[PDB]
Design a protein around this ligand. Structure first.
Ligand SMILES: *[C@@H]1O[C@H](CO)[C@@H](O[C@@H]2O[C@H](CO)[C@@H](O[C@@H]3O[C@H](CO)[C@@H](O)[C@H](O)[C@@H]3O)[C@H](O)[C@H]2NC(C)=O)[C@H](O)[C@H]1NC(C)=O
Ligand code: Y01
Ligand code: Y01
Ligand code: Y01
Ligand code: NAG
Ligand code: NAG
Ligand code: NCT
Ligand code: NCT
Ligand code: NA
Lengths: 287, 218, 218, 286, 241
């Protein structure tokens, strides 16, 4: 019964407003503490350079006008409130593709009596990270993701990390991909003096057995025949069929491994370079 | 931050030993925990690291099949099941936090001593070390207090309440057949020994043995 | 596995002297990003290892400036400006390039000063051990430098090597010397059949071996 | 005495009798100045077969009116407050070269306000332009792709566009990896359409870019240029062994499958032909 | 069930029943009315979210209507489309069983406020549509409690485990029988005499055929390195030989 009166007292548009942000004592900064938690890395499309992950981001901030006298309202400590109505500092990706920027669910927020608010919505994020494809597949991928308020600079809000490492208490084994470390760092730009943001760096390692058994064994299996075609006796007249078939198979594997690799012209996959070199060798063989 | 480990552990050869690693004051399930093995002789060799969140484990190619880590998310505790243990792995085990490619190894544990030998319990001993019969009396003379056949470490062999503390010597433990044998020595002026009463005391907390024996000339 | 080779093994240097230690890898340990991830560890006797250098081109937050580190892509050198009383211990290398990770071999570091005269003393068994039925002859060699010294046991002029236990401690702090104990254990029945028992010590600071002998029947 | 309480009174006062659809100008004859600028977050993709360039663009629009002015020294020294762009007038800047994309700024970001009446607005957007892909020297190619921004329902008498920066800013550019921007030029122009009598302004942004050629010269042209060195090789083979027709048919089917493969990556443009396609047809004939 | 991406797309009718004190009235005073139907946007709605989503909805955004009884009971039946991400275990392909879990639960309420009780021990199947390829062997519901890092209280959850089987006839008539049939030629070439001169043709043709079949089967099974598909092992075995 008293909860309804308490909520109507707090969320009255005549008294509380949404479009303005709280502050005291001559435009003091309202510190916002955000930390991330990786639920499970659900997919990494390397061809499109898109890492789709599940994220729980927790945000804490102090707010003064939402307080109340705890003794009056039957000694209530914390109250749930909808996210749409109370003010919330925007915290959104920048390098995000697919257009989608903000969070998905807009969950309820817990408000204490002192004024501290603690809010965490779920989210699915589609980060865009460059694919360092050099040691395929024995590679380490370095995907960066940025958090920064697209609406506020470092004149009203300031972002500070709570924990130096992303939490993994809710992590589940992804299968193909394996995490190594999850460092987060608060960047600073002295030239602009307003650009402030948080970068989390996911360093990921691919488990090698799948692609190994699938591609590497047939590759070396069929390329071990390039140096073998010569041992065939020439009177039989069968060098041509074997050698042309080997060259055709090498071209097919080259096209396939080029279609699976992300089309980045900055570096060369080592397997592709090896195959091109042995293809030149086998055409010198056929001539 | 703070780390805790298990106490001293002893067991007959061939059995299994499980030690615990407790961590507090940080996000326990967020980055790697690796353990360091230190033989009492020399060198530092690793045993492996694990990520308490996922089931990602790795091992050094030399210690494969010897240890198997295990992690718990509810209680911030890491365990290690040990395979068939031999007399060549009796060493001190450590634990430490590590995060690759970035800031790493800023804190440690305190150390866990594990000793594996065929023995049950042996009290420490009294056997004084008296000077030789034919010796030239010089201005100073060395003393001796010998202890044989005790297990396990540690023991405290001191002089009379620290009265003679300058010039003392405490050696490391070395086996003879199956137990430990140590000695304590100190140089005192020869003009005082025939007059002052000196007695070496042996204290063993693990067996609660407080024994002294006066050394008298021949 | 990328093995690590530290040079030298032991480098005694006096208080205030500059000491440089090299640490080479069997392979190239430069990561593709362009940063070489190497750690220097300092272990003190009886304590957990401490940190002094991470990301060699950088310095640890908490260590004084007297330490420095440098090197090319493969050869690495840790340098100290002025050795203090606190810097005693063992250094260790740690590479962070390829999986798995590994440590070094361990570089011993203590202080250096002039030589000293070794103090040798032999102790025959006591009456309580004769009542027990054993014979422990203990030969102390204290306050000598450097470690180049040999202890030999003679029975009636014949060399004896069975039952010899040789123990030594680290360099003490207040006198900067070494110690070494040699224990010989025999039965009482063998003690009544031999005549002369001799502990001899050969050290650099003595042109003649220090001899300490004693007879049973006098 | 608190800052929020004063800003609330300010926001209540100015939005009391303010209209959205009324073009805010002192007199009918007076004009406004919309300073316009672009920034590229990243270059997503250039699908040449469909003739579509997908870009991620920050649009910077700055202007000012007379109704949203006040005095800062009267409201506890407040100068810049932020308000949702749905409540204030929003000039409609549309691109004419759309192809299955967004014509507008549907994200509806927030907008700043200064004390003198200046207003700044920065909505992110995802645009999909349609530019004439000229593939002749494949892959050593340069692409010239244009976008045509401009007002829709206002003439030059009411709105006059002024390019803020002579060149497209690239301080936050994300390297796609395959495409690097050589240069980007923005040109102010005026046209006259069939609808109306007045002339309408617009701004044409032309991107001249190049394709990084290493990825295709290591997987596409080198295998075909290698296997084409066999068509003359077969004649030297003696006749009695009996496998020259095998080599000939192998080369022909291989190069034909190659050629039919290359038509999936270049557009179906009939104005010009790729040099690689001409070379492959030449080799097939011979 | 897209196993290549490890996503199960299901169509789910959710049934949520509860009761509160405010919405009670008297039927005998209002011409004997008992149940009225109202849009769910106007009344309170508990937040039921699934944790195991991947590129899909987190909620019941359709916002169906809801019934109301005279004593205060309220019943609410929204339909939705859920996209779970379950670990696909493919070892005995195609004779496979899949075990996929969906985790439902409250979000901003502890066990001290909202307590979930499973109405049915088993998932209802009265209106099930037989897809043809997958048949549901069983669907079990479990009530559990956990304790997360955020908070001190414990949070309840309901785990629904679907254990299902794949109908094997299609892949055993179009995928494994061709390769098992052409794998019987690797030993046949040795009986072919060498004077005629076509054994290398047969050998290379068989090798490229198994290569094509392997590179085909590498598309239908997921790219998961935890275990190996048995058919893949057999194909690599025959390719080595
Ligand atoms: C994954 O990619 C990220 C982003 O490129 C890498 O972060 C970068 O790391 C380097 C080396 O640590 C940083 O360079 C350093 O910058 C500071 C100050 O600018 C300077 O004191 C150092 O001497 C050094 O130049 C660089 O700032 C940083 N990039 C950022 C923060 O944007 C990260 O290293 C990559 N992961 C791995 C394992 O390499
Ligand atoms: C896994 C792949 C690399 C196996 C390939 C087999 C050939 C590299 C080896 C197997 C036996 C070798 C031969 C062994 C005997 C000699 C005699 C010597 O004179 C010339 C090379 C030759 C024919 C060797 C040629 C190459 C051969 C065929
Ligand atoms: C772009 C294409 C046309 C290049 C094809 C390469 C030929 C011009 C060269 C490569 C090796 C040559 C041959 C090398 C060996 C000789 C033996 C000689 O007797 C006659 C020419 C011939 C066959 C050469 C013919 C032409 C060949 C095929
Ligand atoms: C399941 C796989 C092993 C089937 C492989 C077929 C071969 C095991 C069978 C099929 C026909 C058989 C042959 C049938 C005729 C004879 C003639 C006989 O003389 C020697 C065995 C041989 C070649 C048989 C050898 C083995 C063959 C090739
Ligand atoms: C690109 O096209 C525009 C418009 O056709 C033209 O004016 C410009 O010259 C072209 N760019 C270059 C570098 O030729
Ligand atoms: C399916 O998985 C769940 C959760 O791990 C487990 O409880 C259940 O036993 C499994 N079902 C079968 C048939 O293995
Ligand atoms: C000037 N606009 C450009 C194309 C259509 C034309 C127009 C004319 C009148 C009203 N709206 C748009
Ligand atoms: C209990 N929920 C499950 C995960 C997050 C946690 C939570 C805590 C406080 C407010 N909302 C959600
Ligand atoms: Na053929």
């Amino acid at each position: 019964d008293t909860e309804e009166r308490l909520v109507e007292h707090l969320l009255d548009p005549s008294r509380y407003n949404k479009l303005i942000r709280p502050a005291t004592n001559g435009s003091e900064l309202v510190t916002v503490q955000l930390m991330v938690s990786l639920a499970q890395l659900i997919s990494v499309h390397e061809r499109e350079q898109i890492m789709t992950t599940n994220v729980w981001l927790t945000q804490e901030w102090e707010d003064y006008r939402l307080t109340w006298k705890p003794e009056e309202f039957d000694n209530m400590k914390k109250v749930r409130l909808p996210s749409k109505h109370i003010w919330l500092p925007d915290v959104v990706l920048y390098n995000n593709a697919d257009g989608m920027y903000e969070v998905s669910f807009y969950s309820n927020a817990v408000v204490s009596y002192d004024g501290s608010i603690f809010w965490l919505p779920p989210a699915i994020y589609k980060s865009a990270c460059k694919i360092e494809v050099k040691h395929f597949p024995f590679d380490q991928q370095n995907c960066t993701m940025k958090f920064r308020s697209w609406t506020y600079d470092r004149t009203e809000i300031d972002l500070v990390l709570k924990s130096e490492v992303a939490s993994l208490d809710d992590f589940t084994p992804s299968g193909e991909w394996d995490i190594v470390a999850l460092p987060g760092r608060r960047n600073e730009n002295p030239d602009d003096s307003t650009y402030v943001d948080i970068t989390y760096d996911f360093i990921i390692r691919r488990k090698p057995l799948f692609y190994t058994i699938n591609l590497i064994i047939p590759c070396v299996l069929i390329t071990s025949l390039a140096i073998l075609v010569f041992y065939l006796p020439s009177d039989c007249g069968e060098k041509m069929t074997l050698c042309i078939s080997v060259l055709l198979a090498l071209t097919v594997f080259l096209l396939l491994i080029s279609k699976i690799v992300p089309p980045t012209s900055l570096d060369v996959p080592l397997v592709g370079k090896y195959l091109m070199f042995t293809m030149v060798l086998v055409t010198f063989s056929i001539v | 931050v703070q780390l805790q480990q298990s106490g001293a552990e002893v067991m007959k050869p061939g059995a299994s030993v499980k030690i615990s690693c407790k961590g507090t004051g940080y996000t326990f399930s967020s980055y790697w925990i690796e353990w360091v093995k230190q033989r009492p002789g020399h060198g530092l060799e690793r045993i492996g690291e694990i990520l308490p969140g996922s089931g990602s484990t790795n091992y050094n190619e030399k210690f494969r099949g010897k240890a198997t880590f295990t992690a718990d998310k509810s209680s911030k505790t890491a365990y290690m099941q040990l395979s068939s243990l031999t007399s060549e792995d009796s060493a001190v085990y450590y634990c430490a936090r590590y995060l690759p490619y970035y800031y790493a190894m800023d804190y440690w544990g305190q150390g866990t001593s594990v000793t594996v030998s065929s023995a049950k319990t042996t009290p420490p001993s009294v056997y004084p070390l008296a000077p030789g019969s034919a010796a030239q009396t010089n201005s100073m003379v060395t003393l001796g207090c010998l202890v044989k056949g005790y297990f396990p470490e540690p023991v405290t062999v001191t002089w009379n309440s620290g009265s003679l503390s300058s010039g003392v010597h405490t050696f490391p433990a070395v086996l003879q057949s199956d137990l430990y044998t140590l000695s304590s020595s100190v140089t005192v002026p020869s003009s005082t020994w025939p007059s002052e009463t000196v007695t070496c005391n042996v204290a063993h907390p693990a067996s609660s043995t407080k024994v002294d024996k006066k050394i008298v000339p021949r | 596995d990328v093995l690590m080779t530290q040079t030298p093994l032991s480098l005694p240097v006096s208080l205030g002297d500059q000491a440089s230690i090299s640490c080479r890898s069997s392979q190239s340990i430069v990561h593709s990003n362009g940063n070489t991830y190497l750690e220097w560890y300092l272990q003190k006797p009886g304590q957990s290892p401490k940190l002094l250098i991470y990301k060699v081109s950088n310095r640890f937050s908490g260590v004084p400036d007297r330490f420095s580190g440098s090197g090319s892509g493969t050869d690495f050198t840790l340098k100290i400006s002025r050795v203090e009383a606190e810097d005693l211990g063992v250094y260790y290398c740690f590479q962070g390039s390829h999986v798995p990770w590994t440590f070094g071999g361990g570089t011993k570091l203590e202080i250096k000063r002039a030589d000293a005269a070794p103090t040798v003393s032999i102790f025959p068994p006591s009456s309580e051990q004769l009542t027990s039925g054993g014979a422990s002859v203990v030969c102390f060699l204290n306050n000598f430098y450097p470690k180049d010294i040999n202890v030999k046991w003679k029975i009636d002029g014949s060399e004896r090597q069975n039952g010899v236990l040789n123990s030594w401690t680290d360099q003490d702090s207040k006198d900067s010397t070494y110690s070494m104990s040699s224990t010989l254990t025999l039965t009482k029945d063998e003690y009544e059949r031999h005549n002369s028992y001799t502990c001899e010590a050969t050290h650099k600071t003595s042109t003649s071996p220090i001899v300490k002998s004693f007879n049973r029947n006098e | 005495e608190t800052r929020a309480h004063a800003e609330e009174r300010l926001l209540k006062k100015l939005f009391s009798g303010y209209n959205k659809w009324s073009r805010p100008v002192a007199n009918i004859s007076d004009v406004v100045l919309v300073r316009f600028g672009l920034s590229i977050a990243q270059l997503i993709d250039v699908d040449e077969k469909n003739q579509m360039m997908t870009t991620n663009v920050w649009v910077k629009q700055e202007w000012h009116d007379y109704k949203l002015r006040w005095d800062p020294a009267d409201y506890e020294n407040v100068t810049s407050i932020r308000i949702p762009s749905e409540l204030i007038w929003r000039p409609d800047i549309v691109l004419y070269n759309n192809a299955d994309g967004d014509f507008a700024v549907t994200h509806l970001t927030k907008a700043h306000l200064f004390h003198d009446g200046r207003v700044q607005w920065t909505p992110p957007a995802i645009y999909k332009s349609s530019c004439s892909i000229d593939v002749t020297f494949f892959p050593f190619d340069q692409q010239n792709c244009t976008m045509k921004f401009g007002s829709w329902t206002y003439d030059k008498a009411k709105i006059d566009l002024v390019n803020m920066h002579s060149r497209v800013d690239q301080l936050d550019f994300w390297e796609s990896g395959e495409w690097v921007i050589v240069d980007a030029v923005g040109t102010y122009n005026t046209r006259k359409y069939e609808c109306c009598a007045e002339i309408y302004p617009d701004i044409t942004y032309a991107f001249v870019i190049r394709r990084l050629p290493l990825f295709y010269t290591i997987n596409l042209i080198i295998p075909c240029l290698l296997i084409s060195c066999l068509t003359v090789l077969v004649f030297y083979l003696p006749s009695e062994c009996g496998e020259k027709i095998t080599l000939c048919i192998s080369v022909l089917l291989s190069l034909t499958v190659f050629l039919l493969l290359i038509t999936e990556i270049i557009p179906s443009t009939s104005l010009v032909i790729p040099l690689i396609g001409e070379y492959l047809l030449f080799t097939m004939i011979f």
